[PDB]
Curated annotation (Swiss-Prot):
UniProt domain Protein kinase: residue ranges: 10-542
Active site: D128, D400
Binding positions (ATP): 16-24, 43, 81-82, 146, 284-292, 311, 353-354, 418
Native organism: Homo sapiens
Tissue and organ distribution: Ubiquitously expressed. Isoform 2 is also expressed in ovarian cancers.
Name listed for the protein in its UniProt record: Epidermal growth factor receptor
Family: Belongs to the protein kinase superfamily. Tyr protein kinase family. EGF receptor subfamily.
Modified residues (N6-(2-hydroxyisobutyryl)lysine): K43, K311
Subcellular location: Cell membrane; Endoplasmic reticulum membrane; Golgi apparatus membrane; Nucleus membrane
Functional note: Receptor tyrosine kinase binding ligands of the EGF family and activating several signaling cascades to convert extracellular cues into appropriate cellular responses. Known ligands include EGF, TGFA/TGF-alpha, AREG, epigen/EPGN, BTC/betacellulin, epiregulin/EREG and HBEGF/heparin-binding EGF. Ligand binding triggers receptor homo- and/or heterodimerization and autophosphorylation on key cytoplasmic residues. The phosphorylated receptor recruits adapter proteins like GRB2 which in turn activates complex downstream signaling cascades.
């Protein structure tokens, strides 16, 4: 296992690089009694724990993690490892900055995840994961070193987790943070991390919220997963095995999941904003997942203050849900759906979106109950229908279309919000089986109130309920009926009553969304068409007193 070596066995040739404690020398080792000259690397520390440290270093065995081959107890202890002809991965991606594909980068990320998951299985803390600490033997095979501070259980601040910078706690979660920084560096082809800011302040910027920006090569899929680790809560960071299985799922089709200049990729841009860039002025109310505040946002380089709505220790499940919500909201771009300006990666993940001055539609029709015209309501219906049609094309079942989840920006243009519960469906999947949970029971369909099945037709049912709410000028649907008793009274075929302003055609459109047979319910395109025909004469189809 351990080879105690004499200085006479090896002779150095050329210095290859410099490390934190000492420089690595390329040299040829002559084993005792042997003539084969093995090319090895020798590290000399600029200086008996090191005996046991070499023991534990040699104990490792995995093609993605390096093993110390021998030590030499001369005037200063030296470490001998097998030489890697292709150098460090950081310099390699720097040299091939224009000649590296997505497949190679994703494969390298897979290899790093596999190797440090092995290190976790061996129960060793690297404490120094970085792009420079990654070495490549053959371009399709990279494998980690620099275990010189491993213990049985300045400094590279730019690659260190916030708990390591401040509280000096080095666990596998900090290693996951360092892995995320390494993936960032590999994506940027070796660009500096937090370039321009010296190490004395990288703790404050991390605490403030600003993180490593999205590289142009990166999609929102890989990058938001490439963050996943920069929250203060350590447990919220993904474990290594999940990282390997997910990146291997990524490696199946790498071309789609990254963009290289020279199955539609998701080029959505997500930007990280300082907590100091914006201030919470007005409380818009309490959302389903928390409280939403309204305030002016000051962006870098532009003095104009854009009023934005901000939404907010969150549980790891809550963190994953807010991760999915941020992905879904940033991935959409439609005139009638709310878009994500950016996120703040503080201890409580904060969501930054454009503000609508008049508030939500339900409150707007409640306060102005005596003044909405027929054209306003009809155009509102067509706009909500267009928004969820665009959502349907994006395969994001909203699952929460309520009058509270649609906002009034301008009287003639409304937007949909509250994408927290929206789950993206696969290209082959047609239904999603939610495992229950606390939900607005009084709005969902029978197939979701009893069978836990959410589909596009569930969104159609929610659309019908929202139309009924809009035509009722803000009256509460199903007044006095419990949450559990909704299914009992609805399985027969009884529905909400007729608003005073709805003609027979309005109700005939409304009912069809509420049919027991989901497949027989109208699709959103046909509803869009029907309400487009209704828009030719708003005064005919409604009666206003
Ligand atoms: C950061 O690099 C290291 C850190 C630690 C060691 C190590 C571990 C035990 C003995 O040496 C060894 C290396 N480096 C290496 N080990 C083998 N072959 C190598 N070819 N090129 C390098 C290289 C260039 C710049 C940094 O490393 C290198
Ligand atoms: C249910 O409503 C939301 C749910 C989530 C967000 C949000 C903020 C960041 C990402 O999504 C934003 C909103 N709503 C909003 N978005 C823009 N301007 C708004 N003015 N007033 C509200 C408001 C009051 C009660 C519920 O919303 C609102």
């Amino acid at each position: 296992l351990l080879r105690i070596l004499k200085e006479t066995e090896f002779k150095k040739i050329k210095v290859l690089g410099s490390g934190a404690f000492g420089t690595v020398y390329k040299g040829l080792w002559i084993p005792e009694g042997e003539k084969v000259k093995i090319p090895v690397a020798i590290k000399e520390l600029r200086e008996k724990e090191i005996l046991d440290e070499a023991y534990v270093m040699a104990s490792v065995d995995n093609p993605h993690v390096c093993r110390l081959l021998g030590i030499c107890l001369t005037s200063t202890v030296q470490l001998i490892t097998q030489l890697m002809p292709f150098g460090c991965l950081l310099d390699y991606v720097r040299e091939h900055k224009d000649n590296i594909g997505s497949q190679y980068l994703l494969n390298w990320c897979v290899q790093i995840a596999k190797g440090m998951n092995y290190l976790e299985d061996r129960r060793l803390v690297h404490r120094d994961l970085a792009a420079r600490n990654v070495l490549v033997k053959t371009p399709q095979h990279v494998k980690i070193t620099d275990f010189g501070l491993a213990k049985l259980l300045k400094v590279p601040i730019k690659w260190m987790a916030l708990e390591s910078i401040l509280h000096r706690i080095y666990t596998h979660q900090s290693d996951v943070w360092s892995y995320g920084v390494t993936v960032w560096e590999l994506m940027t082809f070796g660009s500096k991390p937090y370039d321009g800011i010296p190490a004395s302040e990288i703790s404050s910027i991390l605490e403030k919220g600003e993180r490593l920006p999205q590289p142009p090569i990166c999609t929102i899929d890989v990058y938001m997963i490439m963050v996943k680790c920069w929250m203060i809560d350590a447990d919220s960071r993904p474990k290594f095995r999940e990282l390997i299985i997910e990146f291997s799922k990524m490696a199946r089709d790498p071309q789609r999941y990254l963009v290289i200049q020279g199955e539609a990729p998701n080029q959505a841009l997500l930007r990280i904003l300082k907590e100091t860039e914006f201030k919470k002025i007005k409380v818009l109310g309490s959302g389903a997942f928390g409280t939403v505040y309204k305030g002016l946002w000051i962006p870098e380089g532009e003095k104009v203050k854009i009023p934005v709505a901000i939404k907010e220790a969150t549980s790891p499940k809550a963190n994953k849900e807010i991760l999915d919500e941020a992905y879904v909201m940033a991935s959409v771009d439609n005139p009638h759906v709310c878009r994500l300006l950016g996120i703040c990666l503080t201890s409580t993940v904060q969501l930054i979106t454009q503000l609508m001055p008049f508030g939500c539609l339900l409150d707007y029709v409640r306060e102005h109950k005596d003044n909405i015209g027929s054209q306003y309501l009809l155009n509102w219906c067509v706009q909500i229908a267009k928004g969820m049609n665009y959502l349907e094309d994006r395969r994001l079942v909203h699952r929460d279309l309520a009058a509270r989840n649609v906002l009034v920006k301008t009287p003639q243009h409304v937007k949909i919000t509250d994408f927290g519960l929206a789950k993206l469906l696969g290209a082959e999947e047609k239904e999603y089986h939610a495992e229950g949970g606390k939900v607005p029971i009084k709005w969902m369909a029978l197939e979701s109130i009893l069978h836990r099945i959410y589909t596009h037709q569930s969104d159609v049912w929610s659309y019908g309920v929202t139309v009924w709410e809009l035509m009722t000028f803000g009256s509460k649907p199903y007044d006095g009926i419990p949450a559990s008793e909704i299914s009992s009274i609805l399985e027969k075929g009884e529905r909400l009553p007729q608003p005073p302003i709805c003609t027979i055609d309005v109700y005939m459109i409304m009912v069809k969304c509420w049919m027991i047979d989901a497949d027989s319910r109208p699709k959103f395109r046909e509803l869009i068409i029907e309400f487009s025909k209704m828009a030719r004469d708003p005064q005919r189809y409604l009666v206003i007193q």
